[PDB]
From a paper:
The final construct used for crystallization contained a deletion of 23 amino acids on the N-terminus, which are predicted to be disordered. The twist β-sheet in the center of the α/β hydrolase core is formed by eight mixed β-strands (β1-β8) and surround by nine α-helices. Some residues in the the NC-loop (residues 153-164) that refers to a protein segment of variable length and structure linking β6 to the first structurally conserved helix in the lid domain were not assigned because of the discontinuity of the electron density. There is a penetrating tunnel formed by Loopβ3αA, αA, Loopβ5αD, Loopβ8αK and αK from the α/β hydrolase core and the NC-loop, αE, αF-αG from the lid domain. In the absence of MBP, the NC-loop becomes disordered to keep the the active site open. A Dali structural homology search revealed that [name] shares the highest similarity with some meta-cleavage product hydrolases, with the Z-scores above 28.0 and root-mean-square deviation (RMSD) of 2.3–2.8 Å. Structure overlap exhibited that [name] mainly shares high similarity with DxnB2 in the α/β hydrolase core, while their lid domains vary obviously, further supporting the ability of the α/β hydrolase core to accommodate different lid domains to achieve diverse substrate and chemical specificities.
Residue numbers in the entry:
A (entry chain A): 24 to 160, 163 to 174, 177 to 311
B (entry chain B): 24 to 158, 163 to 192, 196 to 311
Amino acid sequence: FHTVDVKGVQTRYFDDGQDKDPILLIHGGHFGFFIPVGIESWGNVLEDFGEYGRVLAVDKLGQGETGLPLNDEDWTVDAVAEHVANFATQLGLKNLTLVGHSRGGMTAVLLALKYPEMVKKLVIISSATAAPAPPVGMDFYERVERTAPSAELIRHYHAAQAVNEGDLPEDYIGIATKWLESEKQLDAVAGYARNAEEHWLPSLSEGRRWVQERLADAGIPVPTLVVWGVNDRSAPVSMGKGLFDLIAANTLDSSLYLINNAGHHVFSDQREKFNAAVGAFISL
Amino acid sequence: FHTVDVKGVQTRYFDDGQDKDPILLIHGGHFGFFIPVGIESWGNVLEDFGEYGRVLAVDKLGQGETGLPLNDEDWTVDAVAEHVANFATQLGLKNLTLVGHSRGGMTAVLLALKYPEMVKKLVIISSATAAPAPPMDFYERVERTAPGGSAELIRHYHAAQAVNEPEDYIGIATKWLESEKQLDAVAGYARNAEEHWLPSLSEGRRWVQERLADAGIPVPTLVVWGVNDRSAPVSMGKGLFDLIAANTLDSSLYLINNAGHHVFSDQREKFNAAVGAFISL
């Protein structure tokens, strides 16, 4: 991988680096989250999407191997999105296809809404931040954290959310274990404990309100695909269908793809289907 | 463009014809429907799918230029599906990708459930027949609010259906609308609907649902729907996909926004991209 200084934040990323239009992958999780998330969490997609463009993937602010925010005020969704935007600008990325999984999706949306000039296409995978609440379901992550005996924790989480499950390669287990036991993770947990109530959570609620407000106005200004696994255990499909209902309201160029026998990690559960559909979408 | 006899029935079909695995397109509507439907209604699809395989298409029983059912007891859904099946047997199609639209979808589904050995995979487009029952009738309303005719009827119908914007189809449908076969078909429907065809719909639906709740569809399935379908609401599509997903692991749903009942016409590029992707798996 590579490292670049983004506004004083040391930032790790992956680059193809083919002579094609860029595809930017934005992973899930958040700074201080009990499961460490990074570029390697994309597993095979890093390689596979090489068929459809110049793949890049960045560790988000305070995750993977990129440094934590330099300000308490930067423990916000806007600061994460801004970090990704500044990152893309530093590399001179132009005809960008944004691909966002889970919270990354949120990040992705926020970019597509705020910087249309930079974005050509938007792909949203299992992002429930702006999604309408289910009728009744939603304590998945608390349960997963509770039922864990740490490599064991990572293995356990993966097994917990998988539907067409496979076992994680030992290399990824090693990398993520290193993340989980790193000083930066400890600092990230302390930082979340310090800045959650004052900065992160309110920015989350306001982010949801503003996104939904935009979807009910002019909608997303770029072509948008929503991908969801039918058997998602942490982000129920109902939320995906509701989200897409919110999106189709004023975004004419939008689509919804639901894959059966797939969990929160759709790309991991139904690799071939995912690659085919999303690749076809990116390719037009 | 081609003609062949099927069980004593003059049947017209289209062939690509390439050295590729077959793709059988099944159009919608039914015999005696006030709007005549045929192969031409597939428009660009007929050519566009030449990339994903050997495209074949066929006018269903008592539609297009194919003949009417031989007896009145053959005005059933099963008769239509069996007609297409015997057509396939006579042509000997193996590794077959079935693509059905509207009522055609229903046909395809039956073919997928009765003859899995023949079918490689299934695509269902805007077929509400096997869908869960929803909570004035659209087509009756369209016919009621139409002017004469008959070009104005076809244009009124397509206007009533279109959301986001084939010449061959318009011309030929105008010609069919004033043909004798269409008259005979309307009379035949008027005669055999209440006794045969509608019960055939009820039973067909019941058996298909019951089959989905058992072992599900035996082949990989894609459901395609237009969000702004006037004739068959998206809720029916999502319901049908629920029923399918219950026991069909390899199943998928694709919802295209800014698209109505004729999805392939309203959003050609997206449709071709997704369905083509599915077929190339």
